[PDB]
Design a protein around this ligand. Sequence first.
Ligand code: HAS
Ligand code: HEM
Ligand SMILES: CCCCCCCC/C=C\CCCCCCCC(=O)OC[C@H](O)CO
Ligand SMILES: CCCCCCCC/C=C\CCCCCCCC(=O)OC[C@H](O)CO
Ligand SMILES: CCCCCCCC/C=C\CCCCCCCC(=O)OC[C@H](O)CO
Ligand code: CUA
Ligand SMILES: [O-][O-]
Lengths: 31, 166, 554
Amino acid sequence: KPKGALAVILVLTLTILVFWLGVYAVFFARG
Amino acid sequence: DEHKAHKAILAYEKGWLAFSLAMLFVFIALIAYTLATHTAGVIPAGKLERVDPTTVRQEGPWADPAQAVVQTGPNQYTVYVLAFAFGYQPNPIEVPQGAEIVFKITSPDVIHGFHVEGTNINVEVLPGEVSTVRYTFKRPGEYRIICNQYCGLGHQNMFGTIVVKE
Amino acid sequence: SRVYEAYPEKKATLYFLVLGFLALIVGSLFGPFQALNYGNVDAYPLLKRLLPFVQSYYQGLTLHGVLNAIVFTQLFAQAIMVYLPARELNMRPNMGLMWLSWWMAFIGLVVFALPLLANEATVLYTFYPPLKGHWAFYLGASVFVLSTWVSIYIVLDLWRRWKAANPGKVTPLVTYMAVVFWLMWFLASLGLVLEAVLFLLPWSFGLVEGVDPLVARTLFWWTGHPINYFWLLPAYAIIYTILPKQAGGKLVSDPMARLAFLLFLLLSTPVGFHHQFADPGIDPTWKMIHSVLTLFVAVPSLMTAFTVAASLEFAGRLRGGRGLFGWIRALPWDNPAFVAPVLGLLGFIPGGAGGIVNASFTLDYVVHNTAWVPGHFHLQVASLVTLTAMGSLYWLLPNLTGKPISDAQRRLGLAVVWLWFLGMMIMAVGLHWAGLLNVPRRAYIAQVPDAYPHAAVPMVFNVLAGIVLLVALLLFIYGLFSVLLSRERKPELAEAPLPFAEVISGPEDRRLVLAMDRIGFWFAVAAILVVLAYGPTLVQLFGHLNPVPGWRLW
Ligand code: HAS
Ligand code: HEM
Ligand SMILES: CCCCCCCC/C=C\CCCCCCCC(=O)OC[C@H](O)CO
Ligand SMILES: CCCCCCCC/C=C\CCCCCCCC(=O)OC[C@H](O)CO
Ligand SMILES: CCCCCCCC/C=C\CCCCCCCC(=O)OC[C@H](O)CO
Ligand code: CUA
Ligand SMILES: [O-][O-]
C-alpha cells in the first residue's frame, strides 16, 4: 500500500477540512 | 513489484477519489443548508433592477439621503444607499436592531464594494444596477463599511458608517 | 548553430520563455513594495525615485497583475504546450505560425505596455467598466491574447498530422494533454474576446458612450476562471510527464493523467459565477449551480494530488527510501528542477483548500475582496506555476541553448526556489489572516496607517515576506542572467532528449484510454456544458442592457 501517498492526502484532507469548517464557523458568527 | 505497485496505487487511488467525492458533497449539503436560513439574506437578489447613474442624485430615493431610510414592514426597513467616489450616503446609516434591513445600494460612477465590517454583507455595487441584500443587526453599535473593489486613487480611504440603535 | 536548423522549434520556444521571464522580472519588481504595503509600511517614495514613470500604488498594481498573471504565465503556456507535445511526437511545428504567434504576443505586449507605462490605463488586470483605459491597452491585450489561437491551431495541426501517419493509434500522453488543454482554452477565451469586441474596443475607441458593467463582468469571468487552469496546466504537463523522471521514478498511471486533463476540458469553463457571488442581477439558482460545478473542477486536482504523490513516493522507494517519511528524504533535493515544483506542490495544499472555501457560495461573503483572496491565489499561480517555470530553467534551458549549468549555478537555484517558496508561505499567512480581519484587497492600506489596527500581527508576516521575496527576486535576476549570458556552449546538451518519464508498467484501461481519445466528442460536451451553464443568464443580460459612462479616476 502507498502509505506515503496516503499521508499526503491525509494532510490534504485535514487542511481543506480545517479551512472549510473554519470559515463556515465565521460565516455563522457574522450571520 | 512494478506490476504490483500499480495495483495498490490504483486500488487506494480509488478509495481517495470516492472519499473526496463524499466530502465535496457534504459541503454541497452544508451550503444548501445556509441557503435555507436567515444568514442567506446577504445573497444579492438576482433580479435585474436597472436605474440611471447620471440622475440618481437628482431624482429617486437616492436623491435625499435624510430620507433614505424607510419602514417597509412591521419590523422591516429599506435603506437607500449611494456608494460613490469616495464615500457613502447617507453618513451615517441609522437602523434599529432586531429589524430586518433591506439594503438597496447603487453607484453614480464606477463600481464599489459594500462590505459591512463584522458581518456578512459583502456586495459589489455596479453603476446602473441596484443591489438588494437583507440583514438583521443582532448587536447595537457602529459598524464600518469598507470599499473592497478598486475605484481609483481614493479607494483606500473610502469608508461609510452604519449605526445600529438599541 | 546546426542545431537550430533541424530544430527551429527550439528558438521560438526559447523566445517565448525569455520574454515571459523578463515580463516576470519586471512584473515582480512591484511585489515587495506591495508586501510592505500590506504590512502597513510605505516604501513607495523609494520606488518612485527608482522608477519615476510610476505615479501610484495602483499603476504598479496594474503592471504587476498584467505582466505576471497574464503575460508571463501565457508565454510560459505557449512555450510548454507547443514544444513539449511536438518533441514527444518528434515532429516539427509549423515554423511559420510558430513565429507569427511570437510576434503577435510581443507586438501586442509592447502596444499594451505603452498606456500602461504612461499611466493611461491604471485599471488592473480585471479592467472593470466603467473605469476606462486607453484604447491601446485594449487592442494590445486583445492582440496579445489572440496569439494563443495561433498556438491552438499549431498543436491541433501537429496532432492531426500524427493521427494521419498513425491511424488506429491512441493519442500520445503529452500530446493528448496539450490537445485538450488548447481546446479548453478555445471555449474559455470566447468570453473575453466577446467582451473585447462587442464592448471594450468600440467603447475605448469612442464608438459608443458607455458599457453595461454586469454583462462585461459576466463575459470577463467566462474567460476569467479557466485562464487560471490555462496557467496551471502547462505545470501539470511537467509535474505529470517530466517530474517523475527527475525524481528518480515513473508516472504511476497514464490513464489517471488523461482523466485529470479531460475533466479539466469539461469542467474548467462553466464555473465563472464563483467570481460573481456578490454580483447583483444574477440569479441565486445560477450561483448554486456554478458553485456545485466549481466543486467538481476541484476533482481532477484531488485526483492529481494522489497520482503525483504516489509517483513521487514510488520514485522515493526506488531510491532506497524506506519508512513513511524515508521516501521523502530519498528524493533528489540537490536538484532544483525537482525541488521547485514539489515545493509549489506543498503550497497548493493550503492554496486549493483556500479555493474550496471561496467556491462555497455563501462562505465567499466572508473573504470576497479581502486580502484572503490574494493570499489564496499566490499559493497557486505565484508559487506552484512560477516555481515550476523556474525549476524548468535547469533542464529546459540547456535543452534549448546548449548552455550548461554549473554546479555553482545549481546551488543558486536551490536558494531562489526555497526562498521564493518560504516567502510565498509567509505572505500566505499574512494575507489570509488579514482578509479574515476584513482587510480589503487592491488597497494602498499603508496610506491610511491607522485604519486596520486589529491586524498588527499578520502585518509583520507581510513585511517579512516582503524582504524575503525581495532577496529571492534579486537572486533570480542575477542567476537567470548567469545562464542567459553564459560564455560557454555544448551542442550535445541541445541534442540530448527531454527527461520525459516512463509510465509504470501495469495493465490498464484501453477502454477508458480509448473513450477519452474521442476528442471531437468531448470537445462538444464541454461546449454544451457552456451553452447550458452560461446561456440563459447571458440571454437575459443581453435582453436588458444598461450601459453607463466611463470614468478615469486616477
Ligand atoms: C493557477 C491559479 C489558480 C488556480 C489553480 C485556481 C484554483 C481554484 N480556484 Fe482560484 N478562486 C476560486 C476557485 C478556486 C478553486 C475551487 C480552485 C480549485 O481548482 C482547487 C483545486 C486544488 C486542490 C484541491 C489542491 C490539491 C493539492 C495538490 C494537487 C497538491 C498535492 C501535493 C503533493 C502531491 C505534494 C507531495 C510532495 C511531497 C514532498 C510529499 C474562487 C471562487 O470560487 C475565487 C473567487 C473568490 C473571490 O471572491 O475572489 C478564486 C479567485 C482566484 C483569483 C483571483 C481572481 C481575481 O483577481 O479576482 C485568481 C487569480 C485565482 C487563481 C487560481 N485558482 N483564484
Ligand atoms: C515577487 C513576489 C511577489 C509578491 C511579494 C507579490 C505580492 C503581491 C501582493 C501583496 C499583492 C496583493 C496587493 C493588493 O491586494 O493590493 C499581489 C497581487 C497580485 N499578484 Fe503578486 N506578488 C509577487 C509575485 C507574483 C507572481 C509571480 C504572480 C503571477 C504569476 C503574481 C500576480 C498577482 C496578481 C494576479 C495580483 C492581483 C492584482 C489585482 O487584484 O488587481 N504575484 N502580489
Ligand atoms: C470528517 C471525518 C474526519 C476524517 C479524517 C481522515 C479521513 C481519511 C482520509 C483519507 C482516506 C482516503 C482513502 C481511503 C482508502 C480506503 C481503502 C481502499 O479503498 O483500499 C482498499 C484496498 O483495495 C485493499 O486491497
Ligand atoms: C455513512 C455516514 C453518513 C453520514 C454523513 C454525514 C456526516 C455529518 C455531515 C453533515 C452534517 C450536516 C448538519 C446540517 C445542520 C447544520 C446546522 C448548523 O451547523 O447550523 C447551526 C446554526 O447555528 C443554525 O442557525
Ligand atoms: C494561521 C492563520 C490564523 C488566522 C487567525 C484569524 C482570526 C480570525 C478572527 C476573526 C474572524 C471573525 C470576526 C468577526 C468580526 C467581529 C467584529 C465585531 O464583533 O464587531 C461588530 C460590532 O460593531 C459590535 O458593535
Ligand atoms: Cu469605492 Cu474602492
Ligand atoms: O481563479 O480560480
